[PDB]
Structures are given as structure tokens and as C-alpha cells.
Amino acid sequence: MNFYSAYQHGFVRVAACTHHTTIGDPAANAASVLDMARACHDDGAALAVFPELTLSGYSIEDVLLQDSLLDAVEDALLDLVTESADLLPVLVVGAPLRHRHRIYNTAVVIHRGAVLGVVPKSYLPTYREFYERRQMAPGDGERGTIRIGGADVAFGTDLLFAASDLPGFVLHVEICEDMFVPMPPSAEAALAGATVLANLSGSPITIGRAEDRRLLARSASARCLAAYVYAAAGEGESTTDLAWDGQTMIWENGALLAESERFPKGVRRSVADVDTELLRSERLRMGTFDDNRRHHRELTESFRRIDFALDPPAGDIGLLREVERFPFVPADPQRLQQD
Amino acid sequence: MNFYSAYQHGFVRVAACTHHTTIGDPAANAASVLDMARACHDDGAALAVFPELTLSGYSIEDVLLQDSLLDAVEDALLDLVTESADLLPVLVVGAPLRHRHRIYNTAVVIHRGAVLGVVPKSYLPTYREFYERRQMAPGDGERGTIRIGGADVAFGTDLLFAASDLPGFVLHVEICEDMFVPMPPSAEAALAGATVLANLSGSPITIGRAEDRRLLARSASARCLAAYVYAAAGEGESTTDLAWDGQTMIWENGALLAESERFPKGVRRSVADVDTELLRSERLRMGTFDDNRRHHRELTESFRRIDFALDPPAGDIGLLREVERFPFVPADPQRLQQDCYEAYNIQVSGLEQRLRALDYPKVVIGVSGGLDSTHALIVATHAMDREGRPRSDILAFALPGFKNNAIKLARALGVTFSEIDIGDTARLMLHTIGHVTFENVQAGLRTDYLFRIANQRGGIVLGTGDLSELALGWSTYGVGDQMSHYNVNAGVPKTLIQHLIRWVISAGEFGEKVGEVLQSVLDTEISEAKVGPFALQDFSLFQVLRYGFRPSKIAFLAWHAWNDAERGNWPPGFPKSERPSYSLAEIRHWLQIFVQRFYSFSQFKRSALPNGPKVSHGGALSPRGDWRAPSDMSARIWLDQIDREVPKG
Amino acid sequence: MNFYSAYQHGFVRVAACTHHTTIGDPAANAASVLDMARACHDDGAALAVFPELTLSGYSIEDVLLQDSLLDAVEDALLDLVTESADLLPVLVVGAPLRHRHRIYNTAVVIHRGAVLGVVPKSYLPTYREFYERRQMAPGDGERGTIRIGGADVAFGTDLLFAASDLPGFVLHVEICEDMFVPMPPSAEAALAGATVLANLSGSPITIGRAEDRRLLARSASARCLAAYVYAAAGEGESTTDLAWDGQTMIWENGALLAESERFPKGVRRSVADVDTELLRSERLRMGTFDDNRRHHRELTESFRRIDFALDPPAGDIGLLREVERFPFVPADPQRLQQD
Ligand SMILES: NC(=O)c1ccc[n+]([C@@H]2O[C@H](COP(=O)([O-])OP(=O)(O)OC[C@H]3O[C@@H](n4cnc5c(N)ncnc54)[C@H](O)[C@@H]3O)[C@@H](O)[C@H]2O)c1
Ligand SMILES: Nc1ncnc2c1ncn2[C@@H]1O[C@H](COP(=O)(O)O)[C@@H](O)[C@H]1O
Ligand SMILES: N[C@@H](CCC(=O)O)C(=O)O
Ligand SMILES: N[C@@H](CCC(=O)O)C(=O)O
Ligand SMILES: N[C@@H](CCC(=O)O)C(=O)O
């Protein structure tokens, strides 16, 4: 055995990335994504989540409907997919994609030269500063496949991406607003077996919103005994009516593993080692969790499980995790006072 | 790339054929079909639809039940399929076919040597002159397969034929009466993804029936955001009790692409290039269409999708499509009169409501003798007339800086006229900031003065900038002509403005003296040096605003409409001296200027836009309505698309 | 018998009205409605259709979400219902109404002192100049009841209002965009038994749109062997970004019975006598129509049928219908040339 290998001890290294948006320029966005993903690769990450609508920019409104923009997004996506043949992590990249009659607000799950799945956002906010239903169709209840670069790949809200050589790591993906409704796709996903829940977010920033995002990502990670990996848009998005803060964060069962500088100059990543055994153990013990699943048996057995082989690095890559010396004695004085 | 290829620009060429019927003689019918299909092939067509029951004749009644007839039909169908190995288009041929217990009234979808599917008619009229249920069984709800020439092929109402190498082209087929019932198979098919709807018809002709066919084919194509391809039986059908007119027609989203001579001597075809990108775009935009699909999810997910490779011709095969030069200005005089009547009334009623709401302020307007302000002054006047307001509450101003039409118009209409020389204020202002800035100081001070007069005199300032100027950011933003309290011209493209003024003259409502001045404004007035000819920019604007077509597609369309001044039609009022034709090199040139100005530079000017009514179905440019876009975006990708896809000349 | 009575010969008199909109002032709208409805009464009409969102104005955007606006809408509706005790016709009045979580874009079907039903618009355009999904919820698939003035009344897209003493008159209601989608609620309603199809429209006017409205109302009336009664908004709607034309029209089996002045100064009505026997006869003969219904048996048997007694006038009220002398020889020279 290799005793100093985080992977050999049931950790999976995950990254939430905020790239440099160049609105309406998918080649540029892809290039920023590719450069960030190569960093993640170098870090031995298994997973790299990007902001909502990465390849186009979230904030471009009716420019999303322009043939040239949609065409350029496809072209760029196929280049990423080809570049990914050499990248270790699963990439989750946002893209407006044509399917059937409309464009869907999707997250493309990319791995080692192939698209594993395409996941459409389920709930499209059309209120206050949000106009998503104007340009894009709702994903809830879409199944089937979508044709991307001459292959048919699973399409829908019901997908799970399971590492065949790392069974603690089962990915589900949702998008921004999805985690804000009473019954988020990710909650059914966790009952079905998802352990790492990704969220690609656009999320223009307002007073108090960062708290809202935390409240909902944290509670989700706790109620679903899961890692929650979250990435919002930042510099480059249009400031015609909104500002953007680039927040990224990674939660695990209610605990913050990592977050990044708000309003950064330049791109930022949150990278952390998620303990899949911790999630495994919590779930093994909390039988009411499996009880919830059995109660929603129909909902939860209908997930399609797409397999991939991660083949993570076997050597010493450190441990990107804060392990406290005294599990019973919190180092933070305010927390210790409370206990 | 091949830039002159209709197929490379998302067109699919379709044909509706009416052959020579020889009743009870399938070999003869197939021979007519084969000969017509070879023509369609030579034309590069992707699809050729024939009349109901092609192989037998629709009108043979109980002869449909004779073994020898049914046997001959099969033999002929198998020859067609064999001949089709060498034919480009998908053939849709009618045939009475045995399945299970009965004969179905079917359409056989044939392609490159194989049967792709067999589609039975759903609803069999048995009333009036129709006796179909006597011989044939209903198809609604039949699924499974049917055995045709030793192969099992899909059979049923639920089929879609999708071109794998041409995704804009997804065929659904129905038969005659099918499109006449409240809930036609074709409507479910469109929601499932069908973009081209074929109809094989028998349809004996009677007074008023051709209108009925039109009504229903046209409305289907419009309601289903689709092409509708229709072919009825003609010469050769029995005239025992009925006559036949051979009508063929092709519709696209409500518009007639093509139709053929009724009661022809001989066979006739309608052939047209359908714009699959147009349908794509309409559907991308009308979300309620996908909403309808989701509501009928069960109905629409159950379609079976049969794939085929069309492999259409890559070369220049022309463009069988009427591309009008002025998307905003219809060449047909009747249609143009109608649009003008509507534009005008929209403008007026928009302004009447603002005035009513403000308890009838004075209307302040800068009149320079140019087309836009002339027209706005007229609109203002009419609005005031309709609301029983004295024309003297209109305050027209000439604002000379560093024309006679303006004072002549104002005196003739009898509004309140006044001159204010802004030059001194401008000299003062230029000196004070220590001096585009020079043009802008004047343009701004005009607006500044008008606004202040409006405060002073209890008015609102009427904007006069037109849509084409909004599109290109050809205005002075903020303090300048971009700004006003209400803009009646905001929705009207420049190419339409001259026709509204004529329309106003021709109606004659304002009297002979006013008409003379208006005529003079036209004669006199008719910056395009820097922003290009508005005919071209209004063309690109319509494509971008309505469909979001890529630059190369816009270039292709514009070149087909504009490259030859002798081809196509000109709206009324273009003396043959003002009938230019444009080269590709020019069209390319102005398009680069257009995408850069439209997508990148100009949006901030539209972002803070005063109120005013949408006019055109092509769209308007209100950031509160039709056009929501970033004020801080580059146009690199459109510029790059032109570099890559549009030849230099 | 009374031989000169249009009603005794199977006619039902219907009105499509365009009122004076006062945006954000329900009391004022109701007052206009009340006054037009009294006219219809005097004309012996059985039915009076008004424009989309009559009681609030269609064009008021987020003002639709203001409590005071919604409260005033309810008060005004209840006054109408009370005034309707004395009115002969069934009134179909537009109103933004609270139900469950949202406001629905509804048509309230009122008759002789009671609300027969409330019908929500099914398809809410959110594209180009339309933003309906921002303020209002889709009605497709809503059923049940809604509580209006202390009574529970049928709510949903599936309703038929059938005159018990006049069986040729079975009303279905849809709203604007409803008639523009491939499978309109009205088409199922006709297969289920509806003979008179109402449409309340807002429909800001643009070049060519009046044609579009005609194309779609005319084809529907022909394909559904029905009368189609249509009323659009006019003077008074906001001209912040749009104009309005007040078009009203009444179709019967593809033929124009009546239409009103476009861009009128003041209110206008189309009033016409619809021949229910003509519709009856066409349907009796075109068996493929009944075939279509059977094929959509599940769709069509699920309609709820609300009964009311019209008790129309028995006397001579003329005949608001153009009866040509030569059924075989059209009076219009252009049409006659064609025949
Ligand atoms: N026929 C007409 O309608 C008309 C009238 C006046 C001027 N013009 C033409 O157009 C010109 C007007 O010049 P212009 O357009 O440079 O003047 P402008 O002042 O309207 O535009 C530039 C101004 O806005 C700022 N700006 C540019 N982009 C911005 C953005 N994205 N966001 C916020 N602010 C931004 C610039 O820094 C500058 O202050 C004239 O020189 C003339 O040739 C035409
Ligand atoms: N000389 C002028 N006198 C009065 N108004 C003017 C004058 N020049 C421009 N305007 C106003 O400003 C608008 C913009 O015109 P322009 O900048 O010349 O294209 C005109 O339509 C008028 O409303
Ligand atoms: N539903 C949230 C959106 C928060 C987000 O998208 O990040 C709001 O409008 O406040
Ligand atoms: N049912 C239609 C059929 C028309 C046709 O076949 O063209 C009619 O009777 O008019
Ligand atoms: N779907 C139509 C709507 C027409 C109407 O609502 O009257 C459009 O293009 O805007």
C-alpha cells in the first residue's frame, strides 16, 4: 500500500472554479476553463465545477438566442472535450445548448475525451433580476439523449456519474436556482446514491446573497449527508444591471471545507479533499436516510447511472483538509466557548 | 466552405408534385411518379410529395378491393423503391396497402432504395362525396411494422423521418382529411420535433375548396412553426362524380413559398427552398410552443424517429425562394398600404395615450425638414386632432446651428412655429470647455433647449430618432437626440419612413397644401457614408432582430435579394435611377460595420431608451421589450464568422 | 310558436366587446364593463366576451403583483357579479386572480349573480414584447376550485359551460396565446362538445398581427366546426412600449359574422347571431370529427360541464346575420368571379 496517498484513504479531491468570463466569446471562456482545469489536474483533483453558463457567460440575455453565439459555444465545447482526453478531473462546464425546440441552460459533464452527460437546469427564475424563461427552457422531467459532437449522450435531471474505481464518489449536478426550491433535484439524487453534489451558479451578487448561498449549500450538504461543491460567476459578466462576486465554496456534511476570495481580481479555485468514508459512515448509521429513500422509491430508482474510471494518482499528494488535533476540543475560541 | 450552396445555409429543397393519374393502372402511375421524381432529383430536391393514393388513383372506389389491383400496386411500389436507389429526394407516394385484415390508405416514405416507413391515413371521410371507410381502415392508433418487399418497416401515425446530416429537416406525413380535424396528427408531430409536414391529398375540387385547403395548410404551417407541403390529385382521376384540380402548394410559417397552376394540362410541381433555420429560430423564441409539448409529453415522446442520410448537393443550385429587398417594406402595394396604415395608427395611438395620461401637455418638437421629424410632426398633429386638441399646442422649433421645408410644413399644418439660434450658446459652450465634440455640442444643445422649453411651456419633448438609428447607435446619447419624453419613431425603420410619408400624402387627409410640402420633403431628402446604406442595414437588422441568423446567412440572403436590380420586385416609388444593386464585397463590408455597431457599440444607447410603441413584426429595440442585451460586450465572434464564412467578393 | 324569434330558430346572439381600459383602476374598468354588458343585455345577447385582464389592464407589468391592485380587482369582480343578477348574457371578464401560490391570468365566467367558473390562461408568452411568466402562473393542468366571494367555483382549463335550455350553446373559454400553439385548449374543448369558443386577448398591435389573429381565429372556427368570439384590448392600455387596436371579431365555421373598427375612438362591440343549428348540422355530417374525439377519448371525457339556464328572450329581436339571397351565387363580385 501507499499510506500517504489521500486517495488510498477514501478521499476525493474536488475543485470549485470561478473563471474569467468574456461575455459572448466562448473560445475565450473555454481557454480560461482549460487553463484552470489543467491546474486542477496538476493538483490531482477528480472534479472541477465551473460557473453557470460558463461557455457563453450567464449574463448575455437575448444574445443567448443568436445562432453565431450558439454555434461558437458548440465549437468550444468540442475543443474542451478533446483537451480533456489528457486531464484527470471530471469537468463540469456550463453551456447554453440546443435540444429539440429550445436551448437549455445546461451543465456538460466531461471526462477523459468524452461527454458523460448533459444536465439541464430544472427551475429557471423569471422574477426580480432574472429573465431565464425568456431565452431558455426548463429541464425538469427531460430525459433521453442529446447529440453532441456526433455522439448521443444522456440528457436529463436524473443522472448520476459514478466512479467505478472509487465507489464513494458518485456525482450529481444541479444548477443555481435548483438548490433553492423546496424539493431540489439534488435531494432526490442523494437518496439515489449521489455523495458529491455539484452546483454551477451565475448568481449576480446583492447584499445578503452570499449568506443565502451559504445557508442553502450548507443545509443541503448536512441534510443530504454529502459534499456540496459550488461555483459562481465573477469578473467579466456584464454589469449592465448587476455585479458578480466569484464566490466558490465546498461543503461536507454541514462543514465548510474551503471557500475563495469574494470579488477577486483574477480567477480563484476552492480545492479540498472530501472524505467519502465520512459520508459513507454517516449514511450507514442514519437509517432514517435510507427510510426516506424507500418512501420515495419510484423517484429514486429511476436515476440513470453513468460509469467512468477516474484512475486517480496513487502517490503522496498531501491532504487538502484541516484535520483538528482535538476532535472533542475545537481550536476556534468562540466555538470552544460555546461547547 | 461553399458560400453559394443553399444547403450549406440551412435550406432544404422540397417539391409537391401532381402526376398524371391513370386510374386502376399502378405501373402507369409509378412511371409518371418516377419521371417526376427524376426531375426533382435534377433540381436537387430533398423531398417529393405526391397525391393521395398515387399508385392506384384515389377515385377508383370498390376497385381498391380487387386483388389484381392490390397486387399490381405492390409490384409497382417495389419498382419505385428499386429506382429510388439512384434518386436524391425522399419520395412520399400514396398506395392502398394490405395490413392485418384490411387495406390502409397509406403514404409510403421511400429513400435511396429502401422504405423508411408506411403511414396510414388517420381519418377516413365517409360523408357527402366521400366513402373511404367502405374500402379502407382508419390508421389512428396503428403502430408496429408492415411487411413490404421482404422487409419489416415501421407502420403508423406516430413516425418521424429525420435527416441525420441535416437536423433542421424532420419529416412527418399525414393524409388529406388528417389536417381538417380539431387535433391533426401533424400538430402532435410538430411538438415532437417535425419541421416539414407533408400532406398527400385526393381532394376532389368544388367551389370554395381551394380556399379551405389554403386556410388549413396555411394555419397549420403558422400554428406549428413549420413548412407544410401539399399535393392534390389532378388529371386522370375519374370524373364519374367529381372533378380534380391538381393544386400543389408549399407553406412556411404562414407564408406561401410556392403553388402551381390549378386545372393544369399536364403534370405540375411546386418546388421551393424551405428555410429550416427560420423554423429553428421561431421555435427557439416561442417558449409557449415547448410548453405545449410538455403539456402533451405522453403524446409527443412516443414518436418513433427513423433516421436517414440525405447527403444533399454541396454546390451552387441557386435559391428557389423570394427574398424581398426590404424586410420592413413589402413590395406588394396592397400589403404595403396595409402596413403603412398600421404603422401610422400605432404611432398615433401610442402618442395619444401618453398625452391623455399627462392631461394634454404641449408637444415640443425640433423640426429640421428631414424625413424623421417631418413624419413625427405629422403624427403629433394627427394625435392632437383625434384628441380634440388645438394644433397650436404643438410647438415646433427650428434650431439652426452653424429646412425651409420645416417652416413651410409648420405654417401649413398650423402648429406653433418658432426659431431659436443655438449658435451663440454653442460658441459659449465650446469656448468654456476650451475647444465629434463640435457636432455634439450642437446636437446636445438642441435637446437641452427643447427640454427646457418643455419645462417652461408645459410640454413634453417628442423624440424623432428612427429604429435604424437605434440599431446603429447613430444619435447623440443622453444630452442629444437619443433622449426625449416620448419617441413615436423608435419602432419605425428608416426604410419604412419614406413610405409612411407617401402614405400620408396619398391618403390626402391633411389637405393639398400640406401634401405639397410633404412631397417636397421627399423630393429634397432622397452619414450613409460611414454607417452604410440603410437598405442594407435595415436588411441585416431584421435578420438579426427576428431570427438571430449568423452573419454568413445574412450575407447570403442579402446577396440573393440585392445583387441584381433587374431581378425581384421593388416596392412602389423607386424611380429606376434609385434602384441600386450591391456586390458581395459591399454587402460583406456593411455587415462588418453592422455587427460591430449593433452587437457591441450601440447597445448602451438603447439601454436608456425613452418610451414609444413597437411597430414592426420584425421587432423593436426597447431594452424593456424585444431586445435585452449587454452594454459592454465585444462583437469578436460575429466579425470572426464573417472572416471565416463570407468570401471577400 | 314565435316564428320571428331568432332564439326559437336555434340562433344564439353573442358579443365581443372592447372596453375603455384604465390601467391599474379596476373600479373604472368594471364600470366600463358594466355599461357595455348592459348594452349587450338590451340587444338580447347571450354572451359578452371582454379583453384579456379586463379588470386590471393587461399592460401593467409588475403592478399586477401589488396587493392593493389585486385587492381592488377582487372587489370590482364581486360588484360585477352582483350587477350580473339582472343581466341576460353570460359575461366573460378578464382578471388577475390569486390562487394557491400565484396569480393566474384568468377569465371569470359570470352569470345571473354567480360565478360559473374561472379559467386560467394556459400558455404565458415570455419572449419578444411579452413577459407574462414573470408575474403570472401557467394554467395548463390546473383543476379544482377557487374561492371567489365566499363560494367555491370550478377552476381550470377543462371547463364547459352548457346552456340547459339551449343545447346548441356550449361555451369554452381560452385566452390569447392559447389559440396560437399547435394544440390549443379550444380544439380539445370542441371535440368535447364546445360549440362557441371565446378568446379574451390583450395582444398589443403590430404590423401584420391583425392578419395573424384572423388566420388563427378563422382556421380554429373552421377546423372546430364552431363559432369563435374574440376581443382584444384597445384605448387605455399603456403605451410605454406598445400600441393597442381594440379589434373584436366573431367567426363561424370559417366565415366572418362580424368585426369592429380597428383603433376606434371609444368602445366597440361586435354583435352577431350565431347559428347553432349550422354547427350542429356540420358536426352531424363530418364523422371524422367524432373520430378525432374518440381517438382523444381520455382528453375529451375529462371536461367538467357547468350548467346554466340562459332563458333568452322569446320575441322578435331581429336577426343580426347577413343571410345571402343566393346561397349558390355570392353577392361579392370578386367571390362570384372566383366561383
Ligand atoms: N443622424 C443622426 O441621428 C445623428 C445625430 C447626431 C450625431 N450623429 C452621428 O453620430 C455621432 C455621435 O457620436 P458618438 O456616438 O461618438 O457620441 P455619443 O456621445 O453619443 O457616444 C460616445 C459617448 O458615450 C460614451 N460611451 C461609449 N460607449 C459606452 C458604453 N458602452 N457605456 C457607457 N458609455 C459609453 C463615450 O465615452 C462618449 O462619452 C456624430 O459624430 C455624428 O456623425 C448622427
Ligand atoms: N437645424 C435644426 N433645427 C431644429 N431641429 C433640429 C435641427 N437639426 C436637428 N434637429 C433635431 O434633431 C434631430 C436629429 O437630427 P440629425 O442629428 O440631423 O440627424 C432632428 O430630427 C430634429 O428633431
Ligand atoms: N432565489 C434567489 C436567487 C439567489 C441566487 O440565484 O443565487 C433570489 O432571488 O433572491
Ligand atoms: N372534410 C373536408 C375535406 C376537404 C378536402 O378533402 O380537401 C371537406 O368536406 O371539405
Ligand atoms: N405568438 C404571437 C402572439 C400574437 C398575439 O399574442 O396576439 C407573436 O409573435 O408575438
3-state secondary structure chain C: CCCCCCHHHCEEEEEEEECCCCCCCHHHHHHHHHHHHHHHHHCCCCEEECCCCCCCCCCCHHHHHCHHHHHHHHHHHHHHHHHHHHCCCEEEEEEEEEECCEEEEEEEEEECCEEEEEEECCCCCEECCEEHHHHCECCCCCCCEEECCCCEEEECCCEEEEECCCCCCEEEEEEHHHHHCCCCHHHHHHHHCCCEEEEECCCCECCCHHHHHHHHHHHHHHHCCCEEEEECCCCCCCCCCCECCCCEEEEECCEEEEECCCCCCCCEEEEEEEEHHHHHHHHHHCHHHHHHHHHCHHHHHCCEEEEECCCCCCCCCCCCCCCCCCCCCCCCHHHHHHC
Query: Which set of grid coordinates corresponds to residue C104?
Result: 393566474
Give me the CATH number covering residue B351: 3.40.50.620
Q: Report the run of H or E that residue A148 belongs to, with start and end.
A: strand A145-148
To probe the interface with B, which of A68, A71, A124, A146 has the most B CB atoms within 10 Å? A68
- B311 with B225, same domain? yes
Residue B599 per-residue DSSP state: I
Domain's final residue, options B500, B527, B554: B527
- 3-state SS assignment for residue A236: coil
Please choose, from the candidates A209, A207, A254, the residue with its C-alpha nearest in 3D space to the C-alpha of residue A232.
Answer: A209
CA distance C215 to C207: 14
Give the torsion sign (CA, C15, C18, C20, C22). positive
Between the alpha carbon of residue C48 and those of residues C148, C164, C258, the distances in Å are 20, 18, 14
Phi, psi of B532 (to 5 degrees): 90, 170
With an 8 Å Cβ cutoff, are A23 and B629 in contact? no
What nine digits make up the cell of A289? 436516510
Residues of A in contact with B188 (CB under 8 A): none
Q: Do the strands A159-163 and C102-111 form a parallel or antiparallel pair, or are they unpaired?
A: unpaired
Cα atoms in the Cβ-side hemisphere of radius 13 Å centred on A102:
25
Q: Measuring from atom 3 of ligand 5, which residue has the nearest CA? A: C177
Query: Do B368 and B308 fall into the same domain?
Result: no
Contact in structure between C52 and C58 (CB atoms under 8 Å):
yes
3-state secondary structure B450-476: HHHHHHHHCEEEEECCCHHHHHHCCCC
Domain that holds residue A194: 1-322
Neighbours of B430 (CB within 10 A): 14
**A23, A62, A239: residue with CB nearest B627:** A62
DSSP character at residue B596: I
User: What Å distances lie between residue C5 and B231, B433, C39, C273, CA to CA?
Assistant: 46, 83, 19, 11
Tell whether residue B370 is among the known ligand binding residues: yes
Same domain, B493 and B566: no
Distance between CA atoms of residues B596 and B495, nearest Å: 21
Give the position of cell 437605434.
B470
Residues C181, C123 contacting (CB under 8 angstroms): yes
Q: Does A100 touch chain C (CB under 8 A)?
A: no
Query: B376: which 3 cell numbers?
Result: 413625427
Alpha carbon distance B644, B637 (integer Å): 10
What is the C-alpha separation between A170 and A119, in angstroms, rounded? 15
Q: Which residues of B touch C60 (CB under 8 A)?
A: none
Q: Are B18 and B260 in contact (CB under 8 A)?
A: yes
Which residue, A19, A59, A24, is CA-closest to B636? Answer: A24
Question: What is the spatial distance between Cα C323 and Cα C339, in angstroms, rounded to a whole number?
Answer: 18
Intra-chain end-to-end CA distance of chain A, in Å? 38
Q: Which value, to the nearest 10 degrees, does the dihedral of the CA atoms of residues B352, B357, B362, B364 take?
A: -70
Q: What are phi and psi of C318, to 5 degrees?
A: 70, -165
Q: Is B342 on the interface with C (CB under 8 A)?
A: yes
Q: How far apart are the first and last CA of chain B?
A: 14
Please name the amino acid found at residue C83: E
Positive or negative, the CA dihedral B492, B496, B498, B500 is: negative
CA dihedral of B564, B569, B571, B577, whole degrees rounded to 10: 40
Q: How many CB atoms lie within 10 A of CB B159?
A: 25
Q: Closest ligand 1 atom, CA of B631?
A: 31
Nearest CA to ligand 4 atom 7: B203
State the Cα–Cα distance between residues C79 and B129, nearest whole angstrom.
54
* N residues, chain A: 339
| Number of Cβ atoms within 10 Å of the Cβ of C334 | 8
Q: b or e along B12-37 (b: 16 or more beta carbons within 10 Å of the residue's beta carbon)?
A: bbbbbbbbbbbbbbbebbbbbbbebb
8 A C-beta contact, residue B226 and residue B280: no
C-alpha to C-alpha distance for B171 and C61, rounded to whole angstroms: 40
d(CA A244, CA A202): 8
Write a three-state SS string for B483-523.
CCCEECCCCCCHHHHHHHHHHHHHHCCCHHHHHHHHHHHHH
Look at chain B and report how many structural domains it folds into.
Answer: 3
Q: Which residue has the cell 414609444?
A: B612
Q: What is the number of other CB atoms lying within 10 angstroms of the CB of residue C333? A: 8
- C-alpha distances out from residue A78 to A21, A28, A161, B450, Å: 19, 14, 20, 55
Query: Nearest CA to B618 among B627, B610, B609, B606?
Result: B627
Contact A238, A23 (CB under 8 A): yes
User: Does residue B89 contact residue C254 with C-beta atoms inside 8 Å?
Assistant: no
C-alpha cell of residue A331: 481550536
d(CA C119, CA B321): 43
- Long-range contacts (CB closer than 8 Å, 24 or more residues apart) made by C41-44: C41/C86, C41/C87, C41/C88, C41/C89, C43/C13, C43/C15, C43/C271, C43/C317, C44/C7, C44/C13, C44/C88, C44/C312, C44/C313, C44/C317
What are the DSSP calls for B67-118, one per residue?
HHHHHHHHHHHHHHHHHGGG--SEEEEEEEEEETTEEEEEEEEEETTEEEEE
Chain-centroid distance, C-alpha B26: 40
* Cell reading at C304: 367538467
Rounded to an integer, what distance in angstroms lies between the CA atom of residue B194 and that of residue B172?
A: 6
Which ligand 3 atom is the nearest neighbour of the CA of A180?
Answer: 1
Bridge partner residues of B356 (DSSP): none
Cβ–Cβ under 8 Å, residues C146 and C115: no
Report chain C residues whose CB lies below 8 A from the CB of A134.
Answer: 126-127, 131
| Last residue before each break in chain A (C–N > 2.5 Å) | none
- Residue C85 C-alpha, separation from nearest chain B C-alpha, in angstroms: 34
Which residues touch B236 (CB under 8 Å, ≥6 apart)? B20, B21, B22, B23, B57, B244
Separation of alpha carbons A194 and A161, rounded Å: 8
In angstroms, what is the span from residue B621 Cα to ligand 3's centroid?
Answer: 28
Burial-class residue B579 by CB neighbours within 10 Å (0-12, 13-18, 19+): exposed
Considering the domain architecture, whether residues B571 and B614 belong to the same structural domain is answered as yes
Residues with Cβ within 8 Å of residue B496, at least 6 apart in sequence? B328, B329, B339, B340, B343, B616
Three-state secondary-structure class, residue A301: helix
Q: What is the Rg, in whole angstroms, of the alpha carbon atoms belonging to chain C?
A: 19
- What is the enclosing helix (H) or strand (E) of B638? helix B636-645
State which amino acid sits at residue A280: R
Write the DSSP assignment of A169-224 as a string of letters.
-EEEEEEGGGGGSSS-HHHHHHHHT--EEEEE----B-TTHHHHHHHHHHHHHHHT
Q: For residues B521 and B534, state if they share a domain.
A: no
B150 and B281 in a single domain? The answer is yes
**Interface size between B and C, measured as CB pairs under 8 A:** 184
- For residues B533 and B565, state if they share a domain: yes
For chain C, the first-to-last Cα distance in angstroms comes to 39
C-alpha cell at C177: 396565446
* Per-position DSSP letters for B245-304, written without gaps between them: ---EEEEETTEEEEE--SS-SS-EEEEEEEEHHHHHHHHHH-HHHHHHHHHTHHHHHT-E
Instruction: Give CA–CA dist A123/C80, Å, rounded.
Output: 38
Query: Helices in chain A by DSSP H: which ranges?
Result: 26-42, 67-83, 132-135, 185-192, 209-223, 276-285, 287-295, 297-301, 333-338
- A193 closest CA partner among A46, A107, A304, A116: A304
The phi, psi pair for A161, rounded to 5°, reads -115, 115
Closest by CA position to B391, among listed B490, B510, B517, B503: B510
Atom of ligand 5 nearest to the CA of C176: 6
Which of A269, A184, A261 has its CA nearest to residue A221?
A184
Distances (CA, A) of B143 to A79, B118, B192: 42, 10, 17
Q: In this structure, are residues C159 and C119 in contact, taking their beta carbons and an 8 Å threshold? A: yes
Phi, psi of B140 (to 5 degrees): -65, 130
Q: How was this structure determined?
A: X-ray
Buried b or exposed e, range C97-106, using 16+ CB within 10 angstroms: bebeeebbbb
C-alpha cell at B385: 386632432
Residues B314 and B332 in one domain: no
C-alpha A249/C-alpha A257 separation (Å) is: 8
HEC per residue, B180-248 = HCCCCHHHHHHHHCCCEEEEECCCCECCCHHHHHHHHHHHHHHHCCCEEEEECCCCCCCCCCCECCCCE
Residues in chain C: 339
Measured distance CA(C67)–CA(B261) in Å, rounded: 61
Domain endpoint, select from B322, B351, B376:
B322
- What one-character DSSP code corresponds to residue A231? E
If we measure between CA atoms, which residue out of C77, C56, C11, C32 comes closest to residue C250?
A: C11
Is B497 within 8 Å of B375 (Cβ atoms)?
yes
Query: Which grid coordinates belong to C138?
Result: 401557467
Pairing assessment for the beta strands B248-252 and B227-231 based on DSSP bridges: antiparallel
Return the ∠ at Cα B363 (arms to B358 and B364), rounded to 5°. 130
Cα C205 from Cα C209, distance rounded (Å)? 6
Spatial distance between the Cα atoms of B360 and B322, rounded to a whole number of angstroms = 46
Q: How do strand A227-231 and strand A248-252 relate by DSSP bridges?
A: antiparallel
B52, B175 contact by CB (below 8 A): yes
Contact indicator for C274, C196 with CB cutoff of 8 Å: yes
Resolution in Å equals 2.7
Describe the strand order of the beta sheet including C227-231 as a list of residue ranges.
C255-259, C248-252, C227-231, C196-200, C170-175, C159-163, C304-308
Separation of alpha carbons A45 and A269, rounded Å:
11
Q: How far apart are the C-alpha atoms of B434 and C127, rounded to whole Å?
A: 48
C-alpha cell at A17: 472554479
Binding-site residues, ligand 5, Cβ < 6 A: B 286; C 128, 176-177, 180, 203, 209, 212-213
Give the pairing type, strands C90-99 and A102-111. Answer: unpaired
> Which three-class secondary structure state does DSSP give residue B174?
strand
Same domain? For B133 and B88 the reply is: yes
CATH at B641: 1.10.10.1140
Ligand 4 pocket at CB < 6 A: B 125, 128, 176-177, 180, 201, 203, 209, 212-213; C 286
Of the partner residues B285, B550, B632, the one whose CB lies closest to the CB of residue A238? B632
CATH number for the domain that contains residue C99: 3.60.110.10
Residue B168 shares a structural domain with residue B141: yes
